[PDB]
Every structure is written in C-alpha cells, then in structure tokens.
Design an enzyme around this catalytic site. Structure first.
Site, PDB file in Angstrom:
ATOM      1  N   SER A 140       0.814  -1.220   0.000  1.00 28.39           N
ATOM      2  CA  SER A 140       0.000   0.000   0.000  1.00 28.39           C
ATOM      3  C   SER A 140       0.847   1.270   0.000  1.00 28.39           C
ATOM      4  O   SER A 140       0.623   2.173  -0.813  1.00 28.39           O
ATOM      5  CB  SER A 140      -0.938  -0.011   1.203  1.00 28.39           C
ATOM      6  OG  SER A 140      -1.696   1.182   1.260  1.00 28.39           O
ATOM      7  N   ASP A 144      -2.765  -2.787  -4.270  1.00 22.52           N
ATOM      8  CA  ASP A 144      -3.696  -1.974  -3.485  1.00 22.52           C
ATOM      9  C   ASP A 144      -2.977  -0.791  -2.846  1.00 22.52           C
ATOM     10  O   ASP A 144      -2.736  -0.809  -1.635  1.00 22.52           O
ATOM     11  CB  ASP A 144      -4.399  -2.820  -2.419  1.00 22.52           C
ATOM     12  CG  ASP A 144      -5.629  -2.140  -1.834  1.00 22.52           C
ATOM     13  OD1 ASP A 144      -5.955  -1.002  -2.232  1.00 22.52           O
ATOM     14  OD2 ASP A 144      -6.290  -2.757  -0.974  1.00 22.52           O
ATOM     15  N   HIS A 161      -7.644  -6.182   2.773  1.00 27.20           N
ATOM     16  CA  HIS A 161      -6.452  -5.458   2.363  1.00 27.20           C
ATOM     17  C   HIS A 161      -5.300  -6.400   2.039  1.00 27.20           C
ATOM     18  O   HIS A 161      -4.265  -5.951   1.535  1.00 27.20           O
ATOM     19  CB  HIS A 161      -6.033  -4.481   3.469  1.00 27.20           C
ATOM     20  CG  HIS A 161      -5.130  -3.382   3.005  1.00 27.20           C
ATOM     21  ND1 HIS A 161      -4.381  -2.621   3.876  1.00 27.20           N
ATOM     22  CD2 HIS A 161      -4.882  -2.891   1.769  1.00 27.20           C
ATOM     23  CE1 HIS A 161      -3.694  -1.724   3.193  1.00 27.20           C
ATOM     24  NE2 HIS A 161      -3.981  -1.865   1.913  1.00 27.20           N
ATOM     25  N   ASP A 220       5.673   6.367 -14.721  1.00 30.16           N
ATOM     26  CA  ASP A 220       6.783   5.988 -13.856  1.00 30.16           C
ATOM     27  C   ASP A 220       7.603   4.832 -14.412  1.00 30.16           C
ATOM     28  O   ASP A 220       8.752   4.653 -13.999  1.00 30.16           O
ATOM     29  CB  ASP A 220       6.269   5.614 -12.464  1.00 30.16           C
ATOM     30  CG  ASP A 220       5.759   6.809 -11.687  1.00 30.16           C
ATOM     31  OD1 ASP A 220       6.265   7.927 -11.910  1.00 30.16           O
ATOM     32  OD2 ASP A 220       4.843   6.634 -10.854  1.00 30.16           O
TER      33      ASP A 220
END
Lengths: 417, 213, 204
Positions: free
Chosen positions: A127, A151, A219, A170
């Site tokens: 994350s 995520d 998550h 990127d």
C-alpha cells in the site's frame, strides 16, 4: 554518496526464506559477490508497506517461497523499513519520497558499475510500497521494465501531483489492483483513481467476500490474488474490460476482441493504451480464486401482458465434464415481448454445454398456494455466450413443455442447432 | 401490514398476530395502544403525520372509540415481538446548518433519551441525503417508559475502524435546534445547547442538548 | 485423446463377480496385460441403463455368473454410469450420445492397437443401454457383430432420427425384446416401433 542509505537491503535464498543473513551494501563491492547475485536472470524487489509492530508481516515469507518456486534461479531483494515505518500514518506518508530516492540510488549504482541491463526488474509494492516504487523509477537513468502495485495507499496520495504518486509515466508497464476502494472520494483506504496502464477491479473493488486479523481482511487480498497467480501457471484468471460497475452485472460487456480481456497477475500481456483502463472479474472466498463467466440472454414471449418484479429463478448447467445444479439469480421487471440478459458464474468446470433447466420458484409456502392459477410465460430460445472460449450456442425446447409457470415443474432445454 | 417481526408453528407465524394483538388488548385494560392515521406507508416512516385532532388517533382492539367516517380509513402503528405489544412514538425534527456545502448519504446516527422516570440510551437510526441548510424529520420508537424529556445526546458514528481513520479531518456540521413532538401526550418541546460544543463531527464526542425553553 | 473417458471400464472374474477390482484404461497399456484379457475368445460388453440410487441393480451380479457359466474363458466388460445416470430422465437422455462415443473410442483403440478382430463382440443393452449400444457401433471403423437390446427406452427416442436411436443399420445383427410396450403412441415406457432385424413380442 553512500552513507545516507539507512533503508537497508537484503537477499534471501530458497533454502533460507525467513531471515536476513547476506546483506547488500551500496558502494562496497566485496558483498555483491558474497551474496551470489546471478547476473543473468531477472531481479525482484519487494518493498514493504506500512506496519505497526516491529517485525515483518505474514505474507512476505510466503511470497518469497512463491517467487522461488515460480522463477527458480532468480533474485528477490527485500527492502527494510523497520526504523521508519513504525510511526503514525502522516509520519510514514512522508518517508516514501526518501526511500524511493534510496532505491533509485541503489539501482543507478547497480546499472552504472556492473552494467546491469535494467530490463528485467520487477518492482512489487504494497500500500505504501506501490507509491515508494512509483516515486522510484522516475529518478533513474532510464525506464524500468515493470512496476506492480498491490492496493496502493489512498488518503494523502489522492488529489496529489503526478510526480508525487504512482503515475502511469513511472515505468514501461504498470498494473494496479484495487481491492479495498470503499468510501467517500478522498477518504478511502485504497485509491479510487485509475493510475496504471491496466487497472483491475476484482469484485468491483468495494470489498471482498471474506469479511485484529479480521480487521485487515480485504487489504491482504491484493497479495493472496498474486500468490495464487504465481502458483497457478497453467491456469490463468482472465479479467474483462467494461465501462462501469453497473454494466458488468448486466453482462453486456463480455467481449474479447481489439485489446480486451487481459489476464490477471503475473501472466498479464503487455498492452499499452491511451486512457485509463478499468477491468473487472469475480472471485471466490478460498485459495483457488478462479471462477468462470457465462452470459445468458432470455427471450420472453406470451399473450397476457402482466408485469412483475423481484422474481427469483433457479438454473442448472449440464455439460460434458461435470454439472452445476442450483445456481440462483433474480430478475426485476419481467414482462412479455422483451429480451433480458445478465451475468452468471460458477466454480465447477463444465467443458461444453449440453442442456439447461430453468425453474421459477414460489415465494409462498402455504397449502392455499396451489390455487389462484399461477402466472406463466412462453419461453422460446436462450442465447448463451461463454466467457473464455468464445462460443455462442443456441438453446431451445421441443414443441411440448414450453411453458414456464411459477411453482410448477421446470422446463428443460437442449442444444438446438 | 407486510409482515410481523417474529418470522409448522413457524409457518403460520404472522397469521396469529391478529389474535395475539387482541388478547393483549383485552388483558391490558388500563393501558391502550394508540394507532395513528396517515395516508401512505412511506409517509408514516417520515413521521409527518403524528396528528391527533379532528377524529384521528384512535385506539386499537377492544377499547376503540366508535367514530364513523366517509371513506376508507388506513391507520398505522408499530409493535414489539413479545407479549407486551405497546411501543411509544416520538417525532424528531433536526435543523442542519453550517458553511461547507457538502452532501453525503446513508449516514448512521445514534441518539439517547433522558427523562424523568427512566432512560433510553442507544437507539439507532439512519438518514440519507444529509446536507446544509435543511430541515429533516423521521420517526422514533422505544419500549421503555420515559415520562417527560429532559436531555438528549446525538452521536454520528464512524463506519471506518482502521488506525488510519483518525486523520483526514472529518466532516462536521453546526446543529442549532431540535424540535421534539411526542405521540400520545401532545407536547412540543424545544431543545438546544449552550454556546459551546455545538459542533457534531463524525467519529468524535457527541453533543448534549438540554431543555431550551 | 484419452482423458475424456470419464465413463470408466471394468473387467470381472468368475471367482469375483460383485466387485470392480481390475480396471481397464484406454491408452495405458500396462493394465491390459494386468487384467488377463484373453485375446482368443469373444468379448461381452454389458451397458448399464437408468438408475435412481447410487449402486448397481440386482440383475448384473446374476448376469455375470450366467455368462461365465454359459461361455467359460471369455470376457465380460462392465461399463460404469454412476456419475451420469443418477439424474432426472431428460437429463440422462442426453448422455447416451457421449457414452456411445466413449465406447466407440475404446473399441477403436482395442481394434487399432492390439489388432482385435471386432468379429466376436456382443453388446448387451438395458433400456438406455440399448440406445447407448446403438449410438455406438455407427462410430466404429467397421461393423460390430451383434448388438442385443433388452427392452429399450421409449419416450424421447421414439419419433427420432435413424442416426439417433437403435437403428437396424447399427450392426450386422440386432435383436430387440419388447416386454413393456403398453401405452399411447409416443407415451410408452418401452418403444413401440420395430427396430431390429428380429423383433420379439413376448405375450404380445
């Protein structure tokens, strides 16, 4: 220029996955040949996200073994965070702009001393790790190959600048999972903005059907969907391109032509696009995370014009290999002379379809309910379009039993052509 | 009239409530259960129709008053799943005010009731489409006798549980007044706060309102 | 081409008639010499019809002993159905077009590897088994010798096409019994149409 590298580095072996024995040091070159860095294969860099305790999380000693089982004789470098991540969250939301510069200096050192190609580098990110890998790469001498974000962080990185977050410029190819995007705009745990070249929303991205361990349930699906994609090499899980969450439930967008229907995880095809690319699939709550996708179009016909709502149906699937018997679905606003479509999924392999029942159940249970003659319709055809194998079969019945009626015996359809 | 909150004995569950609501009305002579006249099922949930004048608000069961009418007469009430089938009915009107115009939806609130005899502490309710410079109303019920109201908390809870959630400064409003109209005893009290702590904010300490006039 | 053969196979002995010990596998050739398939005699293939429970019926462990008493030193192969027959009847009325293809692939494998003659094969069939043996044989490399049908299925197979049911062109010699043909035309349990070279109506 090699004493501001306090974010350490490590290299792990398949025989020792849970420790940090052989370190790498940027600048000291007697240690690169000490850790046996094989200069021919690819290199994985696993960046750790946020934590609250002192040790690592529980998914890293499984992801190490999964990478060393899928790609043997390779390089998995574990970045360290444990003097910078054990903080509060706006405190650790500012250290990414330093850790990404440290990783950029390490990669420029490896690419300017040993003449490393920078063409076989995967940047895995959690994350905060995805935004760390995103602020890295922009500060390298040339483009890195692939950055995978699992995520990414939501709160302080949404509404920011493109040189501040995981932007699509990127790297050369960036894929991002979006497992936990529930909440208001700007107040979500995962990021709601599409940021990658490929942006996959499993189950739409609101939650996952499995919800202190229970607190962070949805998550860790962005890691358990990637470990499964590393383990299941021969069986890919396709994800389907659509335009909105509500349209995918109607099943109007199971189309796999013109750079649509890519895979999910490690086996994804490198396809660039012009805009944001939202993609969809469904999953299952256990360790095999693959389900199939079927489109069913039903033609209603009859004489008595009577609309209804919220009617529950039950359908079966009869094929060559196995069978699926009691799949439930509902349809609101049923009426005569229409054509309705929806989406249907299952977890048992079928093969090629042969027959298909169709039952319209009764909500009432009383012994009264056998009377007051039930509503019925006259079903002619069902068009079925499979998901992966693009076959468009046609189903019909004989010129008997072609009358579906609520709380009665179901119709049985066969292969019609 | 759709169903009853208690659902071979389980098969005919909500068909025997029309007898168990009448046996209770025969037993409870001194305590009648009032039923309220409205115009639709959706309007009674908003609480816009707690009016007991001009041949409205009759009783239920044996103790009903003989009042004839000109048309069909739909009347409403709520019940409880046990043998005392009486609940009270309260109307709450809330004035939202503030500066930052930001609409939200499906927000969950928690309210308390502090009165003379007893108290009710953690009654839940929800309101969709909350925004500034509006006036919202709903219906509220309970099963504990109160008497006359004195004070009333108001808490707007947080759906998030993470340790992240203390930041990203939470939305808030500026609540001035609450008009409360009781069901049976037609009293229309006015509640307000002092010129401190008048700022309800999600996931924070609740405001506390007193008898204002 | 030998992993879509989920309808299994078995070979039974006169000393062990009620079990399914030694299986045959199409493609794996270490098992043919394991079950002692005598390459000189004839071969019986008993195809199971419809069922509603999970096990076999009661006539198969008697028919095995009867075949091994009448024709000793022979071959009786029992076809398996127990993941495809325990269904409803229009569900199991569509699986015959797959099981007959599986049996046809097995017989073409035996006739193209071991050079089996296909001149000494009896195909015994029950109510759905007779139509299974009828949809087999038409998909073989040459004609099978004899298919015997024992009261075939009636409802969904009457009024059908000749390449869909037990037709008289399916083999070289076909005999069919018709024990239970009571009912209306098209609504009978047994089939009312004469289909074989010899069609016997016991007691009418």
């Amino acid at each position: 220029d090699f004493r501001d590298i306090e974010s350490k580095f490590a290299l792990r072996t398949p025989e020792d996955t849970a420790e940090d024995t052989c370190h790498l040091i940027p600048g000291v070159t007697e240690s690169v040949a000490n850790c046996h860095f094989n200069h021919s294969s690819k290199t994985f860099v696993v960046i750790h996200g946020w934590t609250v305790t002192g040790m690592y999380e529980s998914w890293v000693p499984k992801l190490v073994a999964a990478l060393y089982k899928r790609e043997p004789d390779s390089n998995v470098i574990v970045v360290d965070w444990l003097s910078r991540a054990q903080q509060h969250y706006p405190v650790s939301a500012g250290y990414t702009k330093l850790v990404g510069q440290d990783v950029a200096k390490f990669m420029n050192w490896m690419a300017d001393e040993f003449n490393y190609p920078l063409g076989n580098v995967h940047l895995l990110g959690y994350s905060l790790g995805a935004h760390a890998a995103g602020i890295a790469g922009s500060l390298t001498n040339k483009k890195v190959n692939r950055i995978t974000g699992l995520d990414p962080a939501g709160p302080n990185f949404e509404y920011a600048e493109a040189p501040s977050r995981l932007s699509p410029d990127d790297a050369d190819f960036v894929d991002v999972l979006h497992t936990f995007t529930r909440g208001s705009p700007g107040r979500s745990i995962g990021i709601q903005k599409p940021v990658g070249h490929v942006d996959i929303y499993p189950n739409g991205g609101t939650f996952q059907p499995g919800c202190d361990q229970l607190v962070k349930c949805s998550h860790e699906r962005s890691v358990h969907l990637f470990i499964d994609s590393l383990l299941n090499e021969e069986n890919p899980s396709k994800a389907y391109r659509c335009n909105s969450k509500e349209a995918f439930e109607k099943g109007l967008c199971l189309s796999c032509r013109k750079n649509r229907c890519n895979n999910m995880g490690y086996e994804i095809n490198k396809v660039r696009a012009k805009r944001s690319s939202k993609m969809y699939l469904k999953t299952r709550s256990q360790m095999p995370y693959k389900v199939f996708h079927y489109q069913v179009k039903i033609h209603f016909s009859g004489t008595e014009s009577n609309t209804y709502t919220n009617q529950a149906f039950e359908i079966s699937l009869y094929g060559t290999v196995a069978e699926s018997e009691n799949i439930p679905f509902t349809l609101p606003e049923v009426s005569t002379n229409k054509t309705y479509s929806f989406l249907l999924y299952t977890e048992v392999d079928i093969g090629e379809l042969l027959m298909l029942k169709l039952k319209w159940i009764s909500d009432s249970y009383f012994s009264w309910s056998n009377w007051w003659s039930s509503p019925g319709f006259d079903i002619g055809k069902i068009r079925v379009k499979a998901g992966e194998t693009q076959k468009k079969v046609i189903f019909c019945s004989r010129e008997k039993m072609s009358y579906l009626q609520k709380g009665k015996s179901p119709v049985i359809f066969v292969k019609c052509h």
